[PDB]
Design a binder for this molecule. Structure first.
Ligand code: HEM
Ligand SMILES: N#Cc1ccc(COc2ccc(/C=C\c3ccc(C(F)(F)[C@](O)(Cn4cnnn4)c4ccc(F)cc4F)nc3)cc2)cc1
Length: 470
């Protein structure tokens, strides 16, 4: 009834298994039979799926009274991030919170991050056992996750948090990260041992962050441009109340989780693709020689934006491997589709997957082929034509006519896109300077994508060859 119900075999499990294995293949098979609208039930709820640029526009630009993001996620995210932040509050408070973070991610702050990021990556390569010797292999996902957590903590989280990852922050975030698995999506409240560790880790992280805050106020000073010393001053809401340290702590935790899971996954895919394409890596290296010079001066916020192909590699990687595959909202009021007789009721969830349009033939010819040169049409870290609407933070292009929305659109769109492009590009440029990458003998292509966790990542333990240049 209403949108076409998918023909499945069982109650309550539905196609979740088909969805969990590969959402895109599942979304594509449903599109062949049902069109740009399906409705499949993953476990308990009814999830309506609207595909196409309209489908993304319908859900991402849905009216605030009609769709609800927090209700869908809050129970999973709130125990991990903490209270009063992000989803644990009305949408208005989220917009102010987004404002504070985007406030602290200005270009001058981004400028200060580049030398820090280069320092951490160079320090890692020299001190980490992952790249010792002229030639060898290395666990891509494990190594890359360490690099993204070092670069994000040093720049964004600050000195103390960066120092804390040398002792008892590693185990804290591993314990806290156990909160995410979608099993928690439904039973985030059950007192299973993994949830008890999550709660214990969340409390301990909060106490540590606030002590770092209290220590700074005891000195009443400030150093350089981290979102910690920012949220201390960027505390006043429109009502006139300063952001309490507890909220600051929980925001940092949220930024800590969101940045790492997204950066580690994408950067891993970047390294994996470059191993399959040695010609592309050598072309990246030649770009730095041509654009920056034979001397290869240190990377800065300025000379990074000249890298055109480096940006393309990130863009093409995001197109096929963006860690989020399903955006999901809770339907509050019944909504009429603009064109058809279909009506989406309240008992339903809505799911928009901009990745489907990002791998459609009509939008990208030969979509599954990873080719950064397809982007010789246009490049944009900040992108495009459509209208810009402000919901309380900056001015965000809610535009949907685009089939390429890795960071989403509308009032929830990502505010860490610039920081992500800064971090990914910097790490990539540094790794391009230092290494060549090859697959292990006999290995062709790339590993499959794991969709079982909230975030998607490469499937198993993937190793590739590294070879230093000098
Ligand atoms: C490639 C890396 C990243 C990807 C692919 C990504 C993806 C996304 C997507 C798809 C959304 C919209 C989801 C929705 O509408 O429900 C989003 C929102 C957001 N992301 Fe990211 N993100 C990335 C990096 C980051 C980073 C580095 C941060 C913080 C430093 C961050 C913080 C956020 C925040 C705060 C939101 C707002 C969510 C909302 O308002 O509902 N993201 N992200
Ligand atoms: N068998 C089986 C089986 C397998 C798989 C499935 C289901 O498959 C999936 C896969 C992924 C999901 C995803 C989502 C998801 C998670 C977190 C968030 C977020 F909100 F939390 C986030 O946007 C994350 N983020 C973004 N940018 N940065 N961070 C965020 C926002 C603000 C913030 F400050 C920090 C944040 F990190 N948003 C969306 C859901 C289902 C079912 C069954």
């Amino acid at each position: 009834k209403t949108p076409p119900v998918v023909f499945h075999w069982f109650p309550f499990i539905g196609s979740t298994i088909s969805y969990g294995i590969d959402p895109y293949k599942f979304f594509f098979d449903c599109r062949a039979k049902y069109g740009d609208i399906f409705t499949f039930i993953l476990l308990g709820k009814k999830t309506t799926v609207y595909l196409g640029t309209k489908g993304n526009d319908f859900i991402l630009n849905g009216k605030l009274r009609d769709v609800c993001a927090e209700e869908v996620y809050s129970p999973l995210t709130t125990p991990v991030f903490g209270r009063h932040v992000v989803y644990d509050c009305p949408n208005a408070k989220l917009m102010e919170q987004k404002k504070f973070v985007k406030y602290g991610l200005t270009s001058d702050a981004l400028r200060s991050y580049v030398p820090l990021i280069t320092d951490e990556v160079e320090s890692f390569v020299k001190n980490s056992p992952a790249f010792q010797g002229h030639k060898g292999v290395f666990d891509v996902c494990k190594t890359i996750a360490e690099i993204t957590i070092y670069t994000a903590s040093r720049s964004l989280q600050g000195k103390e948090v960066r120092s804390k990852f040398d002792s008892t922050f590693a185990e804290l975030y591993h314990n806290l990260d156990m909160g995410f698995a979608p099993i928690n999506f439904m039973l985030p409240w059950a007192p299973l041992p993994h949830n008890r560790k999550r709660d214990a880790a969340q409390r301990k992280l909060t106490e540590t962050y606030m002590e770092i805050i209290k220590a700074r106020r005891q000195a009443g000073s400030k150093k350089d441009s981290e979102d910690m010393v920012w949220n201390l001053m960027s505390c006043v809401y429109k009502n006139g109340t300063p952001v309490p340290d507890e909220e600051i702590a929980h925001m940092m935790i949220a930024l800590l989780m969101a940045g790492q899971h997204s950066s580690s996954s994408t950067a891993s895919w970047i390294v994996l693709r470059l191993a399959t394409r040695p010609d592309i890596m050598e072309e990246l290296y030649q770009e730095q020689i041509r654009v920056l010079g034979s001397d290869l001066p240190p990377l800065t916020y300025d000379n990074l934006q000249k890298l055109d192909l480096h940006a393309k590699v990130i863009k093409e990687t995001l197109r096929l491997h963006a860690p989020i595959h399903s955006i999901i909202r809770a339907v509050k009021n019944p909504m009429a589709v603009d064109g058809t007789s279909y009506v989406i009721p309240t008992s339903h969830n809505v799911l928009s997957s901009p990745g489907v349009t990002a791998r459609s033939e009509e939008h990208f010819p030969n979509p599954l082929e990873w080719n950064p040169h397809r982007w010789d049409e246009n490049i944009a870290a900040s992108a495009e034509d459509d209208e810009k609407v402000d919901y309380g933070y900056g001015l965000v292009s809610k535009g949907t006519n685009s089939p390429y929305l890795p960071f989403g659109a509308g009032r929830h769109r990502c505010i860490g896109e610039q920081f992500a492009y800064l971090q990914l590009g910097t790490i990539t440029a540094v790794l391009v300077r230092l290494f060549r990458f090859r697959n292990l003998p006999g290995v062709d292509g790339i590993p499959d994508t794991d969709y079982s966790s909230l975030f998607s990542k490469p499937l198993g333990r993937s190793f590739v060859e590294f070879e230093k240049r000098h």
